[PDB]
Design a protein around this ligand. Structure first.
Ligand SMILES: Nc1nc2c(ncn2[C@@H]2O[C@H](COP(=O)(O)OP(=O)(O)OP(=O)(O)O)[C@@H](O)[C@H]2O)c(=O)[nH]1
Ligand SMILES: Nc1nc2c(ncn2[C@@H]2O[C@H](COP(=O)(O)OP(=O)(O)OP(=O)(O)O)[C@@H](O)[C@H]2O)c(=O)[nH]1
Ligand SMILES: Nc1nc2c(ncn2[C@@H]2O[C@H](COP(=O)(O)OP(=O)(O)O)[C@@H](O)[C@H]2O)c(=O)[nH]1
Ligand SMILES: [Mg+2]
Ligand SMILES: [Mg+2]
Lengths: 26, 430, 49, 426, 48, 431
């Protein structure tokens, strides 16, 4: 999903503070 | 390499294996044509064309239920000699399925079992799906499992059985064919999971909010247990169990191999996203009596051994913090000779939802196979009904006129009377 | 005078969320199923079908 | 010069050895490919101790990886460091042990040894002057307790004059995970108390205690517990591979902690643990390591040292420091806590000094301690064994494999005598 | 010496780390600050 | 080596500490990150070996709603994450809740951090405990903290800065109750308890500073200026330096009369300082004018026992002594007969420090005054009057009854304060 553009580079954020998972901007 | 050869006997085993082998097709992503669009090696064998054929046997003595598999959606998947049909059914009798009708096709079944054992470079054991209350499921099975022990001695023989419900019952002479076939399930069996229909009828009503279910709504929930037991062989996890491993941790004595199965969480699609599916609140549901899939109450009895088979995003810290608070309930009792009563198996893959199904897409699930003494309550209510019928000598001429003596009736009551007598002696604490 | 509008929008949005979650394992598959034309954008007739 | 031949068996030994071979790959500057990417010349000076030279400048570990079930060798080969372990060092059986000590010691565990005993003999003679051995396994399982402790008997008979130090995983009443662990725990202790030289008892519940209270992490996993165990394992042989002021091998830790041949059980502790938030707000100094060292919340065994007496105490130090503050700190704790040491032996505290600290840390210290409180570990196993052997429970997995019922009688009788020997020396 | 929000064996419903309940400061930060070089020995440091 | 330890209890003390720590960081040129940009800090800050600096204070509160503000604010990189001690529910303006029921669950965690700071300290000089009388937390928690620290450390000075309840404006209804229950125990476990009210600072901000509607930040900045001025004699070097124990002995002639008052000079805006020169005599007379006491009381009624003047900046003893002579020759200030030498002065070579965005002017000198007066007996008489007007009909009593506090302790505290007021009268009368 990160490889697959539909989403700008600013759209990807970390899920929490100091967490490995990535989510989208609300 | 690690793989199981599944056996389905009777009209029950075909309709359980219709909804069980549906999930194995969907768990490994197997198309109904038989091809992918090595975890599948546990069931699906390879071929040079790239297609996958299951390692299963479907047995019945009527061609009425197998012809629908042969003319249904999955006609290209099952091998043409992995669906064996008899011409005439056993007609709700033990003697027909054990001596006259069930003897003419045992030579054909043995050859196909001998084939699928030869392709198996390593075989773990056999899994059986049948019915206690049927003619083929109790008559033909009692000669297969006798004959399986002669050829393959130390192989495991697990069992998923359809036991009579305490109140409702579909067949009149079901208590005869429930009592008489137990002898094959003592010496020639290793672990006998039992599920009945009233104990699943109540579950789909008060949990799934389905007012009017049918057998396809029951066969999927039975089909969800068998994948959770096998899931450690198939997919990676933190702690893996096996047919050698959880037989070690659930039967202390060779005559006690009768656990009770359960499954949680069991909810609908609408209710799922408002609750928190905590690790504590999927293991507290299993210990409740309303989630039991055998109509008996563990409050009367005492646990001996238990096993927990987790799937999904499960942390081992959450398991131990939920097990620790379980031990402080006074309502759950244990015998004094088992201070360590849990086995933990962790598998990474979360369960998969079927299209058109009733269960929701969840992240965590646990199947607990608990051994108790309260299963002796179930047999007493069935041993009560057998002697009430046998006192007036009813329906006996159907049995002695087909090939067994009338002396197998006295053996049937006296053999499992000691199996009753085994449970009070074991249930007494040291 | 928009309470019926808000209730219907909320019901449709929640139903679409749960249907998408139960049918599609990921989100890109859901987007590609919603947009059949492959233009990268979702149109009104695509949304209604 | 002198080398340690690591052994790992079972599922637990493979995962501990997955993390053990990670930090000594980190400290010597070893990439996952196999080559060397380091910044100092001290790391390459004694690298032959654990890593064997090959073509292309490639270093491979001198360890065997043994299990009866291939379910965990596939994963450890597909980990971050799975390329570096030699494929000839994966010995595998096809049938699982199944949590039975009998299957792993007479039927399946008695056949696969001849392949393991062959491949360890090719590696033992390749060493110039082999120091000894080291092993990680699990008492609660089938393969580690069964066939790991069978190699304990066989390789001690072939080489009498070596060093055998073990890293056992004893069961736990609170983190209990298997029904028949009392049987495979008790019957393996009988093999341990005679054929080993030192014993470091790792416990599962004593590691959750550190991560909750000392390390401040809400949801630990096995990747965090194995790091703490692998931190000690690198820090116990730290002077065999780096220079120092007063360096000590595995011989000098054994001749200073063992006054009698049946007194060879320890429990270890690790000094620098702090929290995540207070990583940079706490001064790390010689008084601070000593205070963290001797507390009961830092111990890696489920036994309270206040209920017993320390017999003899070892301490090894890594990092640049002052020699006077080392001598004074463990003399003060020896003098103030006069009732917590026995009075028939003086100088119960052993000191060793290394110079290189671990990576990203400046001063570190490992504590190895023989204490009488390890009796409390074996008494709780004994009370579960008597309460379950009296009902003849689960025996058909043991009698039906080739044993007599008296093997449980002698196993409980010797373990009752080992706890009898600790109490008279208190 | 135990803070009121230390991790333990008590079962509690866990929310996201944004919400200031239970332990949030310890989970907000990152564990790793582990970068250093080997600072050599007394013998080479002193004898020149 | 000469170091002090700080404790911040209750919302008022926590926010005053929030104001003052920024002031100390800007005086020493220290970022909230903790490092200096590129030994006088040794009184207050401790050098971490990595390069950071940490403060010697413990911020404790039974409610998280004001300390989570500090934790999520821009000073998250300053304090120590174990010093910040939280409860789960406040005292709800209840002394029994602050001292008997919820105050016992966290005091071991309170004392352990203080023990660790004492072990870190190579020298210890005193305690700086910041709270308010009015609140239940700041009225109850400080009582058991004072008795526990008096059990732990015997003869250490315990300087205690309390927001005094103003006679007219106050924000609580159990404030007389909380003040009386604090001063029951404050007499026997303290030596130097300074009082600050709200209405005097309100009047000063309205008239001197020409600020119509002041917020709490102005009050907190002014109190931070007071604390920085009083601890500058421990931080910096001066010609005449004042130590904690020695001015405690100066200010406490009798063990039961230990409630002094503090004033600051000069407090003017930026416009008036351009036009006015502030000579030393004018500044120290503005100290003695009735409009510049930061406690609302009538100074003409009471006399002065002893007082100290702590000067900051370019201040010289020639005009110090000349100004003291002018104050003595002025007739309206009346001194007690048994104390001829009631003036003690100290001088520091360092100027005051402004805060950017503030309302205080830039000056070349300043002074802090500490005085021992008998004028506060009127305020305490008013406090006893409002207290026994509540106690006549037993109002607001059953909450304290149900929390775990008895009834006769009210009467014991009331008679103890009556005895203290009579002691004030008995020391006011002269032979
Ligand atoms: N829950 C559930 N029960 C089933 C299912 N199929 C059959 N049964 C049970 O099986 C009982 C009847 O036994 P059958 O399997 O139909 O009979 P049989 O084994 O073929 O023996 P004969 O009829 O003599 O040939 C019914 O009472 C059902 O309760 C099923 O798919 N799900
Ligand atoms: N100068 C100043 N005084 C304050 C401040 N906040 C509260 N006060 C004073 O505190 C008195 C009431 O006590 P509070 O501080 O509100 O409550 P508390 O002391 O924290 O005790 P709890 O209510 O239990 O939390 C009031 O009369 C105010 O005069 C502040 O920010 N600055
Ligand atoms: N701390 C820790 N414990 C482990 C690890 N791997 C396994 N265990 C423990 O070992 C027990 C199971 O051991 P088992 O797999 O049956 O041993 P084996 O049969 O000899 O391979 C579990 O209860 C785990 O708690 C590990 O990496 N770290
Ligand atoms: Mg049939
Ligand atoms: Mg408050």
């Amino acid at each position: 999903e990160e490889r697959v553009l539909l989403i700008k580079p600013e759209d990807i954020v970390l899920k929490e503070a100091g967490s490995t998972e990535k989510t989208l901007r609300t | 390499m690690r793989e199981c050869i599944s056996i389905h006997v009777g009209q029950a085993g075909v309709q359980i294996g219709n909804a069980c082998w549906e999930l194995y097709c969907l768990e490994h992503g197997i198309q109904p044509d038989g091809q992918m669009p090595d975890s599948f090696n546990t069931f699906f064998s390879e071929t040079g064309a790239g297609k996958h054929v299951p390692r299963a046997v479907f047995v019945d003595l009527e061609p009425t239920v197998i012809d629908e598999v042969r003319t249904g959606t999955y006609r290209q998947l099952f091998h043409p000699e992995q669906l064996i049909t008899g011409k005439e059914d056993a007609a709700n009798n033990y003697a027909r399925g054990h001596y006259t009708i069930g003897k003419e096709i045992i030579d054909l079944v043995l050859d196909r079992i001998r084939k699928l054992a030869d392709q198996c470079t390593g075989l773990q054991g056999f899994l059986v799906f049948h019915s206690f209350g049927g003619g083929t499921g109790s008559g033909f099975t009692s000669l297969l499992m006798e004959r399986l022990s002669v050829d393959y001695g130390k192989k495991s023989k697990l069992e998923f059985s359809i036991y009579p419900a305490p109140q409702v019952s579909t067949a009149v002479v079901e208590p005869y064919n429930s009592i008489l076939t137990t002898h094959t399930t003592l010496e020639h069996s290793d672990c006998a999971f039992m599920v009945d229909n009233e104990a699943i009828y109540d579950i789909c009503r008060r949990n799934l909010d389905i007012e009017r279910p049918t057998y396809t709504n029951l066969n999927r929930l039975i089909g969800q247990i068998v994948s959770s037991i096998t899931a450690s062989l198939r997919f990676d996890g933190a702690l893996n169990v096996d047919l050698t491993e959880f037989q070690t941790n659930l039967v202390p004595y060779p005559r006690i191999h009768f656990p009770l199965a359960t499954y949680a969480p069991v909810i609908s699609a609408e209710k799922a996203y408002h609750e928190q599916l905590s690790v504590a609140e999927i293991t507290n549901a299993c210990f409740e009596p309303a989630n039991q899939m055998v109509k008996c109450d563990p409050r009367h009895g005492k646990y001996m051994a238990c096993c927990l088979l987790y799937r999904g995003d499960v942390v081992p810290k959450d398991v131990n913090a939920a097990i620790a608070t379980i031990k402080t309930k006074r309502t759950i009792q244990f015998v004094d000779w088992c201070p360590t009563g849990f086995k933990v198996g962790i598998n990474y893959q979360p369960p998969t939802v079927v299209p058109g199904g009733d269960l929701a897409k969840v992240q965590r699930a646990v199947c607990m196979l608990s051994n108790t003494t309260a299963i002796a309550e179930a047999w007493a209510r069935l041993d009560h009904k057998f002697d009430l019928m046998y006192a007036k000598r009813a329906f006996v001429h159907w049995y002695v006129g087909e090939g067994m003596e009338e002396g197998e009736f006295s053996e049937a009551r006296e053999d499992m009377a000691a199996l009753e007598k085994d449970y009070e002696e074991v249930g007494v604490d040291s | 005078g928009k309470d019926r509008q808000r209730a219907l929008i909320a019901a449709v949005r929640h139903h679409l969320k749960k249907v998408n979650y139960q049918k599609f394992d990921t989100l890109l598959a859901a987007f590609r199923h919603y947009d059949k034309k492959g233009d990268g954008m979702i149109d009104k007739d695509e949304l209604q079908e | 010069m002198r080398e340690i031949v690591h052994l790992q068996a079972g599922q637990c030994g493979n995962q501990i050895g997955a993390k053990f071979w990670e930090v000594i790959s980190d400290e010597h500057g070893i990439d996952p490919t196999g080559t060397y990417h380091g910044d100092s010349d001290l790391q390459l000076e004694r690298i032959n101790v654990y890593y064997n030279e090959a073509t292309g400048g490639k270093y491979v570990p001198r360890a065997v990886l043994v299990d009866l079930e291939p379910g965990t060798m596939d994963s450890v080969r597909s980990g971050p460091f799975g390329q570096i372990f030699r494929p000839d060092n994966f010995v595998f059986g096809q049938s699982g042990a199944g949590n039975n000590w009998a299957k792993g010691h007479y039927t399946e565990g008695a056949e696969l040894v001849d392949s393991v005993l062959d491949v360890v003999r090719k590696e033992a003679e390749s060493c110039d002057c082999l120091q000894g051995f080291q092993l990680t396994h699990s008492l609660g399982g089938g393969t580690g307790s069964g066939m790991g402790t069978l190699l304990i008997s066989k390789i001690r008979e072939e080489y009498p004059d070596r060093i055998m130090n073990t890293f056992s995983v004893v069961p736990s009443p609170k983190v209990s995970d298997t029904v028949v662990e009392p049987y495979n725990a008790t019957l393996s202790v009988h093999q341990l108390v005679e054929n080993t030289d030192e014993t470091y008892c790792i416990d599962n519940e004593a590691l959750y205690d550190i991560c909750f209270r000392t390390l401040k992490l809400t949801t630990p996993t096995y990747g965090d517990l194995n790091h703490l165990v692998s931190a000690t394992m690198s820090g116990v042989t730290t002077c065999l591979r780096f220079p120092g002021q007063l360096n000590a091998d595995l011989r000098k830790l054994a001749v200073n902690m063992v006054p009698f041949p049946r007194l060879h059980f320890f429990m270890p502790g690790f000094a620098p643990l702090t929290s995540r938030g207070s990583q940079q707000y706490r001064a790390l100094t010689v008084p601070e390591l000593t205070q963290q060292m001797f507390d009961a919340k830092n111990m890696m065994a489920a036994c309270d040292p206040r209920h017993g007496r320390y017999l003899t105490v070892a301490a090894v130090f890594r990092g640049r420091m002052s020699m006077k503050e080392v001598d004074e700190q463990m003399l003060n704790v020896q003098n103030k806590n006069s009732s917590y040491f026995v009075e028939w032996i003086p100088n119960n505290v052993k000191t060793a000094v290394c110079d290189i600290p671990p990576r990203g840390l400046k001063m570190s210290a490992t504590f190895i301690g023989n204490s009488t409180a390890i009796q409390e570990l074996f008494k709780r196993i004994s009370e579960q064994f008597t309460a379950m052997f009296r009902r003849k429970a689960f025996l058909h997995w043991y009698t039906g494999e080739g044993m007599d019922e008296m093997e449980f009688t002698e196993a409980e009788s010797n373990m009752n005598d080992l706890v009898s020997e600790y109490q008279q020396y208190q | 010496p135990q803070p009121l929000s230390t991790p333990s064996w008590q079962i509690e419903t866990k929310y996201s780390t944004k919400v200031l309940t239970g332990n949030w400061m310890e989970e907000r930060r990152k564990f790793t600050r582990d970068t250093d070089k080997t600072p050599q020995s007394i013998y080479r440091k002193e004898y020149i």
